[PDB]
């Protein structure tokens, strides 16, 4: 059983910059008769199913940009992205089909870019959720970089930690940013008691938190 190995396991570069990535096999993938290496390279963008990039170690498949290039032979193989784009965010897997099939562990390409403060929005409970007895206050902190960001919830000025649920998107393929949703969930009774609800985002781009709030009894 041919073992396959990729390095590095993660990888982060700027749009327009070159990036290479390595793939090793425990045995030679070259067939002496055909002169061909049975090593292929695939790209799996976030949410999507994988896509074939290169086969026979160096032959670029249809529907694949010319900036992708494969090279190597025997047991050492390389994938060059010659000018990385935002769209190229993905895990890249090499795979042998010389005997059975083995995929590498993957090389994650993260895209680095100029910092961005988050666009914060706060949403009171839907009238529909409050009818059912429940009360979720949601905060979207959109289009920020880098990915480290804290969120805090204040209730009538006092911090609240129980009942929060946080969720990060993968990096965006168009602008290289990240996003996060944070949801503070409560009963309707508990929600009905208090009046001011406040979502604070602490991010590298400011030392001052970005604050968004609303008053329940208002418009």
């Amino acid at each position: 059983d041919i073992v396959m190995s990729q390095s590095p396991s993660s990888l982060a570069v700027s749009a327009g910059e070159k990036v290479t990535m390595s793939c090793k096999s425990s045995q030679s993938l070259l067939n002496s008769r055909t002169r061909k290496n049975y090593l292929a390279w695939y790209q799996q963008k976030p949410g999507q199913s994988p896509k074939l990039l290169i086969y026979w170690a160096s032959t670029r498949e249809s529907g694949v940009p010319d900036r992708f290039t494969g090279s190597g032979s025997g047991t050492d193989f390389t994938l060059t992205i010659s000018s990385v784009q935002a769209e190229d965010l993905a895990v890249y897997y090499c795979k042998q089909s010389f005997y059975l099939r083995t995929f590498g562990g993957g090389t994650k390409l993260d895209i680095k870019r100029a910092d961005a403060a988050p666009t914060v929005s706060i949403f009171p409970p839907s009238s529909e959720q409050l009818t059912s007895g429940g009360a979720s206050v949601v905060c979207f902190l959109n289009n920020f970089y880098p990915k480290d960001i804290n969120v805090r919830w204040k209730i009538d000025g006092s911090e609240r930690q129980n009942g929060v649920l946080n969720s990060w998107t993968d990096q965006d393929s168009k602008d290289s940013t990240y996003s996060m949703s944070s949801t503070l969930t409560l009963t309707k009774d508990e929600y009905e008691r208090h009046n001011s609800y406040t979502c604070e985002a602490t991010h590298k781009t400011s030392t001052s938190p970005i604050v968004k709030s609303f008053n329940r009894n208002e418009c």
């Binding site: 914060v120 929005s121 706060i122 949403f123 009171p124 409970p125 839907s126 529909e128 959720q129 059912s132 979720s136 949601v138 968004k212 709030s213 609303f214 008053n215 208002e218 418009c219």
Partner: peptide
Amino acid sequence: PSVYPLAPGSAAQ
């Protein structure tokens, strides 16, 4: 699922 609309509140954003 229960699907709940998120319409924006009182704010200056």
